[PDB]
RNA sequence: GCUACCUAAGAACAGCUAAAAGAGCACACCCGUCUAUGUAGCAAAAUAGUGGGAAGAUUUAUAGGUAGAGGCGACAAACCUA
RNA sequence: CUCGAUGUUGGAUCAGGACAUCCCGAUGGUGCAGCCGCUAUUAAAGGUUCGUUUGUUCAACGAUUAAAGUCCUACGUGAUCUGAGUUCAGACCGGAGUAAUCCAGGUCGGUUUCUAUCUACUUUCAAAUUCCUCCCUGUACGAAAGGACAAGAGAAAUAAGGCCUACUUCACAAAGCGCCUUCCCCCGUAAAUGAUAUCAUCUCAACUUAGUAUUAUACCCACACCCACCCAAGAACAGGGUUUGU
């Protein structure tokens, strides 16, 4: 059972009624536009209505590098390289302008965010805009792509070697010396993962959401 | 996104914008009252020691949703009347520039790719 | 910066004796029913807490004697017994701490 | 002489009983006001030009995005009406002002934390006490009998309203955050002067002018946002979707009133007057009322053609 | 602007805060009743409740053992957590510890609190007790409660 | 007994490069460029970082010498018990 | 007046005021056709750019702008900051002097202390300014060239006040680079009717109109639960919640 990340609210003091009504609007949109299951690293093609484009319809293909936001405003970022130029578009899931979301290739990566692909080689961000979709067998585990990219020479957009980022899909051996790896460890926080009070347990929250989702499908 | 002293990349095939030079093209003025340039805003470039107006067709700064974001700051050299200096634009440009066909009709006429 | 002039006692008395700087009378003081000594409503009684701590200190000393060194924490429950008492059915299999005194009235056996 | 609270002397058995007793009474009192038109309502006059009706008190749930039929994105703030009743009506002569006043409360709270004078005020009215009470200036023909419940259907989509609430208090703040001063540079020699106000006056006057921008308490004051369009009305949960943001944190009580801007004057002809009565309505309103330009969630995708 | 900040600022920093709570938590597990400043006890109380939850996961759970390894600086208390404290609260879903305020510390007049695990072998704390049901106020309310139940049945 | 210079007889200078060095990198050590802090301060001249030198005209312990109309000084009118 | 001390340029910061108005508003005259200007009356609510060189105030120059106003405030403000300049002790060059030494000559370097006693002040107003585009319109005007105003529509910038749905710095939240809202008037003159003076005359004649707001409205508004706990409230105090007091 896959629950979309936007349905799970962030920790806060917001009244649960606000989330419940906001979820109702999301569900009524999902029965008009089908939102398929995807993760960060999947290849998606999104068709949207652009008032100025030729044919009033625009299609963009790219790799989902980040999913963030909650509620109707949830967004995902698709990155691709077109004619040697890196282009990123931050689509909105529940925007009525979106006509169709197609999962060309459903897969997961070693990291929850692929923002470092900007500093990686252009080959890891270049995908064919006319690639045929990959058939996914039913009742099968989502494939995890353990590919590790090669980074461009420093400086980078962000200090990806820092422990707080917790990046596992970068060939740090090929681009960073041992001294730089040791220097980056000065920011490590071993106590952070053992801080029990900072844990966010959403197992009971997700249970209630699924009951709401199942109830909506019946009616 | 693009302001004074900002280095830009010319994406048209004009000789001025592609000739090698010891200084990269640099924005010296933005024709906006707030001094911050966005897509569709004209700026003045000090390129090859000369002052040439350019049209911003992409920048690294995030903008509104459903709009493309580029990894480089892209401009197209244009004349004072708005006629582009170059003849072909291979680099894709946002489709949002088509709302300005009244003044950028010739700039969009040489654009091969829209993203 | 330095004072321009000396502040008089009349000015100083107004500042020092202002009701904001005066001690406020407390109204949450009550008599502890168990011992009769004073206590605050939201604070445990000092006399009774000392009484519990005195007995707790004696018990912990007896615990250390049985353990006989550091890192000797048992993997079973502990039961405190006094003179004239024997382990019960529910106390079987638990570490027994013996105190050489009569069981206090306020320390109810469980 | 010692202070006391409601459950200081209650036993273990009594505390659940008292909580159940008062809670049941509050629900019964609220349920008794559900039919204002069957309890001798005051005369209902038709709307006239220059007439001002009463507003509501709503709780700020949060913010949510919506999209219009032209593709534009508008973010709106959800204001939920929670136990909103008219408390007191004062005549024009007794108001000491130019218009009659109508007192409105909301967000029923515990009786154990209210003053005796307030508790006996609500005892006569027969309602549980309200957290916040606001005073609305109305005309004579817009008078409403005290105790009449108020619902979010009092407003309709397309209407412009004003929202007033206490802003988020930021405590004691310096001039850089409170007043947006530029401050001093970070390097080139600055000695313990980076966020300081600088000069506060001129040397001739020898004093600081009253009303000079100085560090102090920031926020935690009443502010009003004018011209907030109403896009959506949820009659089931009594929620008002007002355009943009409103002052104050989430879960705070706000004051919603018809807009006072000149452009929106005399736009209450089609709005309910003096308020909305669900009991007397011939046909029950739909669950959600949408503005003509709002893309409903069940509507098909936007197509430009 | 400390709006929504739930963690206190204690010690020499973030890491020092964890170590200070860990020493209090380690002392709490060994003695099952410790006394400390009220703020530190209140900050540590949340961690004590969640430590028992990890104990209920069992010693065979690698994640639970790792969490118990970090927070128990004395390794003899790790068997105690999974074999004494965790089985003790098998039938409880919460409320593993009780925190009470004791008189201020003699030296610096600091606000002091006592925290213990419920069900310990130590003598009971002087817990505050509500007024007896036989008091004048409670008798009147009991009579009122009886009247309502009788009327409800009728 | 500080400091300037001198006398007698002592001590210290890792590692690397070059292996020749008033040579380079760089600890100990010596000095005090720049910035911040400090300004009744920890300090009647300091702390933190960054720096110059670090086998030499080096640094340094001990005892001795030169005394005010003077000493001493790789001259800063320096230094000769704040 | 002050040498038993009233601290100097320029900059930063914050600006208070004057109007002899640079821009925006309203008018008179023109060698004012229109578009641009010149000049005068009235108007200080609002605004009055970013940079290269120079310690600079200036000035020159680049790119803009509706405009890049003139002055006062101990040449506003160093118990807020800067120290480039200037102005001690070092040194150099030119020149004056037998030398010491000197030179509104240049040049390099050169310690910016103060824990606030008093006065004053620490949420005033909650009405907004301006540009541009479209349209009017290739119309009025004009031989042609050229080329409006008023009305209307739309989109921005700045300022003020808020907010976190998304983006972004971030993650129980605070923030902007993000989003939302923002409402009256300005008196100079131009015209009637009609006396002194039976025409005429806009009148410190009686009078009429453009022509005016008691600036409209909005905001605020009840009060010992209160020992204690919590808080989107807060330095303390206060304030909100506890029907969320094992
Ligand atoms: K010292
Ligand atoms: K000697
Ligand atoms: K003097
Ligand atoms: K002005
Ligand atoms: K300069
Ligand atoms: K005085
Ligand atoms: K006359
Ligand atoms: Mg960056
Ligand atoms: Mg040149
Ligand atoms: Mg606050
Ligand atoms: Mg700054
Ligand atoms: Mg200095
Ligand atoms: Mg200093
Ligand atoms: Mg500093
Ligand atoms: Mg004076
Ligand atoms: Mg806090
Ligand atoms: Mg501390
Ligand atoms: Mg010798
Ligand atoms: Mg060596
Ligand atoms: Mg050497
Ligand atoms: Mg030495
Ligand atoms: Mg030396
Ligand atoms: Mg060296
Ligand atoms: Mg002698
Ligand atoms: Mg020497
Ligand atoms: Mg000399
Ligand atoms: Mg000299
Ligand atoms: Mg004097
Ligand atoms: Mg200045
Ligand atoms: Mg000013
Ligand atoms: Mg004038
Ligand atoms: Mg004047
Ligand atoms: Mg103006
Ligand atoms: Mg004219
Ligand atoms: Mg001055
Ligand atoms: Mg001064
Ligand atoms: Mg100065
Ligand atoms: Mg100087
Ligand atoms: Mg000379
Ligand atoms: Mg001279
Ligand atoms: Mg120097
Ligand atoms: Mg100099
Ligand atoms: Mg000084
Ligand atoms: Mg100073
Ligand atoms: Mg001060
Ligand atoms: Mg005050
Ligand atoms: Mg026009
Ligand atoms: Mg702001
Ligand atoms: Mg006449
Ligand atoms: Mg006549
Ligand atoms: Mg006439
Ligand atoms: Mg005439
Ligand atoms: Mg009280
Ligand atoms: Zn007692």
UniProtKB/Swiss-Prot annotation, chain A:
Location(s), subcellular: Mitochondrion
Subunit text: Component of the mitochondrial large ribosomal subunit (mt-LSU). Mature mammalian 55S mitochondrial ribosomes consist of a small (28S) and a large (39S) subunit. The 28S small subunit contains a 12S ribosomal RNA (12S mt-rRNA) and 30 different proteins. The 39S large subunit contains a 16S rRNA (16S mt-rRNA), a copy of mitochondrial valine transfer RNA (mt-tRNA(Val)), which plays an integral structural role, and 52 different proteins.
Organism annotation: Homo sapiens (Human)
Full-protein positions shown: 74 to 292 of 292
This protein's encoding gene: MRPL19
Residues annotated with Phosphoserine modification: 4
GO biological process, alphabetically ordered: mitochondrial translation
Cellular-component GO terms for this entry: mitochondrial inner membrane; mitochondrial large ribosomal subunit; mitochondrion; nucleus
Chief location bin: mitochondrion
GO molecular function: structural constituent of ribosome
Alphabetical keyword list: Mitochondrion, Phosphoprotein, Ribonucleoprotein, Ribosomal protein, Transit peptide
Protein name, per record: Large ribosomal subunit protein bL19m
Similarity-based family: Belongs to the bacterial ribosomal protein bL19 family.
Swiss-Prot record, chain B:
Cellular localization per UniProt: Mitochondrion
Gene Ontology CC entries for this record: mitochondrial inner membrane; mitochondrial large ribosomal subunit; mitochondrion
Principal cellular location given in the protein's record: mitochondrion
Gene Ontology biological process terms in this record: mitochondrial translation
UniProt keyword Repeat, yes or no: no
GO molecular function, one term: structural constituent of ribosome
Protein transport among keywords: no
Top-level taxon: Eukaryota
Keywords attached to this entry: Mitochondrion, Ribonucleoprotein, Ribosomal protein, Transit peptide
Function: Forms part of 2 intersubunit bridges in the assembled ribosome. Upon binding to MALSU1 intersubunit bridge formation is blocked, preventing ribosome formation and repressing translation.
Protein family according to the UniProt entry: Belongs to the universal ribosomal protein uL14 family.
Subunit text: Component of the mitochondrial large ribosomal subunit (mt-LSU). Mature mammalian 55S mitochondrial ribosomes consist of a small (28S) and a large (39S) subunit. The 28S small subunit contains a 12S ribosomal RNA (12S mt-rRNA) and 30 different proteins. The 39S large subunit contains a 16S rRNA (16S mt-rRNA), a copy of mitochondrial valine transfer RNA (mt-tRNA(Val)), which plays an integral structural role, and 52 different proteins. Interacts with MALSU1.
Protein name: Large ribosomal subunit protein uL14m
UniProtKB/Swiss-Prot annotation, chain D:
Disulfide bonds: none
Biological-process GO terms, alphabetical: mitochondrial translation; translation
Keyword field contains Ribosomal protein: yes
Coiled-coil ranges per UniProt: none
GO CC terms, sorted: mitochondrial inner membrane; mitochondrial large ribosomal subunit; mitochondrion
Keywords from the named record: Disease variant, Mitochondrion, Primary mitochondrial disease, Ribonucleoprotein, Ribosomal protein, Transit peptide
Pfam family, any one: Ribosomal_L3
Main location: mitochondrion
InterPro entries: Ribosomal_uL3, Ribosomal_uL3_bac/org-type, Ribosomal_uL3_CS, Transl_B-barrel_sf
Compartments, record wording: Mitochondrion
Single GO MF annotation: structural constituent of ribosome
Illness: Combined oxidative phosphorylation deficiency 9: A mitochondrial disease characterized by failure to thrive, poor feeding, hypertrophic cardiomyopathy, hepatomegaly, and psychomotor retardation. Death in infancy has been observed in some cases.
Subunit structure: Component of the mitochondrial large ribosomal subunit (mt-LSU). Mature mammalian 55S mitochondrial ribosomes consist of a small (28S) and a large (39S) subunit. The 28S small subunit contains a 12S ribosomal RNA (12S mt-rRNA) and 30 different proteins. The 39S large subunit contains a 16S rRNA (16S mt-rRNA), a copy of mitochondrial valine transfer RNA (mt-tRNA(Val)), which plays an integral structural role, and 52 different proteins.
Protein family (similarity comment): Belongs to the universal ribosomal protein uL3 family.
Identification of the protein by name: Large ribosomal subunit protein uL3m
Organism name: Homo sapiens
Gene giving rise to this polypeptide: MRPL3
UniProtKB/Swiss-Prot annotation, chain E:
Entry annotated with the keyword Ribonucleoprotein: yes
Organism of origin: Homo sapiens (Human)
One GO cellular component term noted in the UniProt record for this chain: mitochondrial inner membrane
Family affiliation: Belongs to the bacterial ribosomal protein bL17 family.
Keywords assigned: Mitochondrion, Ribonucleoprotein, Ribosomal protein, Transit peptide
Assembly: Component of the mitochondrial large ribosomal subunit (mt-LSU). Mature mammalian 55S mitochondrial ribosomes consist of a small (28S) and a large (39S) subunit. The 28S small subunit contains a 12S ribosomal RNA (12S mt-rRNA) and 30 different proteins. The 39S large subunit contains a 16S rRNA (16S mt-rRNA), a copy of mitochondrial valine transfer RNA (mt-tRNA(Val)), which plays an integral structural role, and 52 different proteins.
Pfam family, one: Ribosomal_L17
Annotated GO biological process: mitochondrial translation
NCBIfam families linked to this entry: L17
Name this protein carries in UniProt: Large ribosomal subunit protein bL17m
InterPro entries xref list: Ribosomal_bL17, Ribosomal_bL17_sf
Tissue specificity comment: Detected in adrenal gland, mammary gland and adipose tissue.
Listed PANTHER family: LARGE RIBOSOMAL SUBUNIT PROTEIN BL17M (PTHR14413:SF16), RIBOSOMAL PROTEIN L17 (PTHR14413)
């Amino acid at each position: 059972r896959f629950l979309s990340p936007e349905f799970i609210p962030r920790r806060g003091r917001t009244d649960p009624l606000k989330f419940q009504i906001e979820r109702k609007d999301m569900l009524e949109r999902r029965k008009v536009l089908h939102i398929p299951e995807f993760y960060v690293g999947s290849i998606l093609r999104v068709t949207t209505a652009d008032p100025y484009a030729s044919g009033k319809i625009s299609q963009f293909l790219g790799i989902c590098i980040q999913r963030s936001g909650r509620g109707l405003g949830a967004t995902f970022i698709l990155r691709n390289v077109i004619e040697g130029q890196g282009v990123e578009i931050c689509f909105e899931l529940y925007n009525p302008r979106v006509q169709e979301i197609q999962v060309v290739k459903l897969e997961k990566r070693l990291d929850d965010s692929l923002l470092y692909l900007r500093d990686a080689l252009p080959e890891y961000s270049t995908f064919d805009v006319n690639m045929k979709p990959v058939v996914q067998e039913p009742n099968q585990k989502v494939p995890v792509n353990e590919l590790k990219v090669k980074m461009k020479p420093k400086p980078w957009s962000k200090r990806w070697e820092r422990p707080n980022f917790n990046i596992k899909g970068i060939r740090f051996d090929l681009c960073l010396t041992e001294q730089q790896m040791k220097e980056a460890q000065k920011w490590n926080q071993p106590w952070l993962e053992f801080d029990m009070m900072r844990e966010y347990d959403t197992s009971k929250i997700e249970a209630a959401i699924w009951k709401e989702i199942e109830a909506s499908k019946r009616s | 996104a693009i302001q004074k002293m900002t280095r830009v990349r010319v994406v048209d095939n004009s000789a001025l914008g592609n000739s090698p030079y010891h200084r990269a093209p640099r924005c010296i003025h933005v024709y906006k009252k707030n001094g911050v340039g966005k897509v569709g805003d004209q700026i003045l470039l000090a390129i090859k020691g000369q002052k040439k107006k350019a049209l911003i067709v992409g920048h690294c700064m995030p903008g509104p949703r459903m709009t493309p974001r580029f990894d480089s700051n892209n401009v197209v050299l244009i004349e004072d009347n708005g006629n582009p200096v170059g003849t072909r634009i291979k680099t894709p440009i946002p489709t949002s520039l088509r709302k300005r066909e009244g003044e950028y009709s010739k700039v969009l006429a040489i654009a091969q790719n829209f993203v | 910066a330095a004072p321009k002039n000396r502040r008089t006692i009349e000015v100083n008395r107004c500042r020092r004796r202002n009701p904001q700087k005066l001690i406020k009378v407390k109204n949450n003081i009550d008599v502890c029913p168990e011992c009769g000594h004073l206590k605050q409503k939201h604070v445990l009684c000092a006399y009774c807490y000392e009484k519990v701590c005195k007995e707790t200190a004696e018990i912990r000393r007896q615990i250390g004697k049985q353990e006989g060194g550091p890192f000797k924490a048992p993997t079973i429950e502990t039961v405190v017994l006094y003179t004239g008492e024997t382990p019960s059915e529910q106390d079987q299999g638990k570490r027994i701490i013996e105190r050489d005194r009569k069981r206090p009235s306020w320390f109810t056996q469980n | 002489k010692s202070g006391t609270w409601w459950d200081e002397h209650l036993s273990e058995e009594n505390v659940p009983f008292i909580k159940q007793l008062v809670s049941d009474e509050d629900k019964a009192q609220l349920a008794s006001k559900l039919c204002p038109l069957k309890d001798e309502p005051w005369p209902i006059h038709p709307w006239e030009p220059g007439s001002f009706r009463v507003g509501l008190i709503a709780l700020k749930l949060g913010m949510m995005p919506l999209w219009t039929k032209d593709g534009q994105k508008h973010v709106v703030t959800l204001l939920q009406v929670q136990d909103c009743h008219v408390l007191k009506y004062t005549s024009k002569e007794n108001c000491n002002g130019k218009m009659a006043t109508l007192s409105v409360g909301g967000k029923t709270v515990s009786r154990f934390r209210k003053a005796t004078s307030i508790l006996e005020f609500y005892r006569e009215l027969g309602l549980p006490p309200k957290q916040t009470v606001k005073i609305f200036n109305i005309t004579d023909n817009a008078a409403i009998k005290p105790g009449t419940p108020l619902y979010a259907a009092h407003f309709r989509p397309g209407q412009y309203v004003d929202v007033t609430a206490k802003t988020i208090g930021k405590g004691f703040q310096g001039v850089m955050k409170r007043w947006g001063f530029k401050g001093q540079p970070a390097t080139h020699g600055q000695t313990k002067t980076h966020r300081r106000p600088g000069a506060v006056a001129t040397g001739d006057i020898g004093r600081v002018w009253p009303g000079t921008k100085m560090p102090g308490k920031m926020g935690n004051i009443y502010r009003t946002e004018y011209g907030l369009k109403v896009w959506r009305i949820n009659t089931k949960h009594n929620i008002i979707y007002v355009n943009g943001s409103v002052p104050g944190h989430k879960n705070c009580l706000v004051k919603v009133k018809d807009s006072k801007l000149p452009a929106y004057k005399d736009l209450g002809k089609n709005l309910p007057f003096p308020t909305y009565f669900p009991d007397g309505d011939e046909e029950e309103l739909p669950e959600d009322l949408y503005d003509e330009n709002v893309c409903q969630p069940g509507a098909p995708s936007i197509t430009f053609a | 602007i400390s709006h929504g900040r739930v963690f206190r600022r204690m010690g020499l920093g973030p890491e020092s805060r964890i170590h200070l709570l860990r020493n209090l938590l380690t002392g709490l597990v060994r003695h099952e009743r410790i006394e400390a400043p009220w703020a530190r006890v209140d900050e540590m109380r949340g961690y004590a409740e969640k430590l028992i939850d990890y104990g209920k996961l069992g010693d065979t759970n690698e994640r639970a053992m790792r969490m118990a390894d970090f927070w128990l600086t004395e390794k003899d208390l790790i068997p105690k957590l999974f074999q004494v404290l965790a089985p003790r609260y098998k039938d409880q879903t919460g409320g593993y510890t009780r925190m009470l305020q004791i008189p201020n510390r003699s030296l610096d007049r600091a606000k002091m609190a006592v925290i213990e695990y419920k069900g310990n072998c130590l003598p009971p704390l002087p817990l505050p007790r509500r007024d007896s049901h036989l008091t004048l106020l409670n008798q009147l309310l009991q009579g009122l409660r009886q009247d309502l139940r009788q009327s409800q049945e009728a």
